[model samples]
Target: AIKKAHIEKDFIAFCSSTPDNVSWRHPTMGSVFIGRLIEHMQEYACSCDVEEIFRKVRFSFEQPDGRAQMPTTERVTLTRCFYLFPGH
Candidate 1:
């Protein structure tokens, strides 16, 4: 929607998985992507850029299980580095 809305500047889109793949959900943990995303964000958002946070989130998906899901980032037009700087 960022492309269609022409709001690419300073905008970053993160998808749980590619269009052809299905996102995984655990019965107890809920969304796998979201779970990892939250964990990584909490661990790294304050010190790392958004891209790094997303990269860590993506890395969490690498598992021995056969399930395959690749997180994607699209329509990124960040002109400068972004940091969450949580609580500061």
Candidate 2:
């Protein structure tokens, strides 16, 4: 199964097991809420600094908008024996 994590695992096995022509929703989920928060500034408050380290930060705006919290290594894992492809 293609499981989501801070890093990709078994990228090849993940792609081969899946069937074709099915619509996949949220196939590739990225991590949000990086590093340790000192409480001085939420990640969004320091966009440039946070962006520099993580390269990309995940914030959502579908339904309820604002800073989306941690989609942790375990939480983001999708174990359906299918590929979790991320466009970003």
Candidate 3:
């Protein structure tokens, strides 16, 4: 298991400045890392000069989840879903 250092950032000078939660961004980091990794893998597939291969890889994304999915059903109908670069 990975270790963690909990650096409490909230204001609390009166009581013991101990953190409220366990010492690790592990859960949050783990989920976020999985997302980042998928994008990384997709980018690799795209760069490999294989469209079908990349498309198959992209479909693998649908199996798991849609962290990048349109927030609303309306957006799905109104918005163009392809050929558009997505980013933060």
What is candidate 1's lDDT per residue for 1-88, written digit by digit as tens?
3455543478889999988778888899798888888889889988999988898887777663766788998878988888989998
Q: Once model 1 is optimally superposed onto the true structure by TM-score, how far is the C-alpha of residue 10 displaced, in angstroms?
A: 0.8
- Which residue window of length 10 is worst by lDDT in model 2? 12-21
lDDT of 3 by residue, 3-62 (tens): 985454322111111234221124555643345445655565434423333344444444
Local distance difference test, candidate 3 = 0.34
After superposing candidate 1 on the true structure, give the runs of residues whose Cα lies further than 4 Å from its correct spot: 1-7
| Clash totals for all candidate models | 0, 0, 0
lDDT comparing candidate 2 with the true structure:
0.28
Residue pairs in candidate 2 whose N, alpha carbon or C atoms collide under 3 angstroms: none
**C-alpha local distance difference test of each model:** 0.84, 0.28, 0.34
Would you list the rank order by lDDT, best first? Answer: 1, 3, 2
**Ten contiguous residues minimizing lDDT sum, candidate 3:** 69-78
Q: Can you give the TM-score per candidate against the true fold?
A: 0.83, 0.13, 0.21
Global fold similarity of model 3 (TM-score): 0.21
Of 1 and 2, the candidate ahead on TM-score is 1
- Give the worst 10-residue stretch by lDDT in candidate 1: 1-10
Of 1 and 2, which scores higher on lDDT?
1
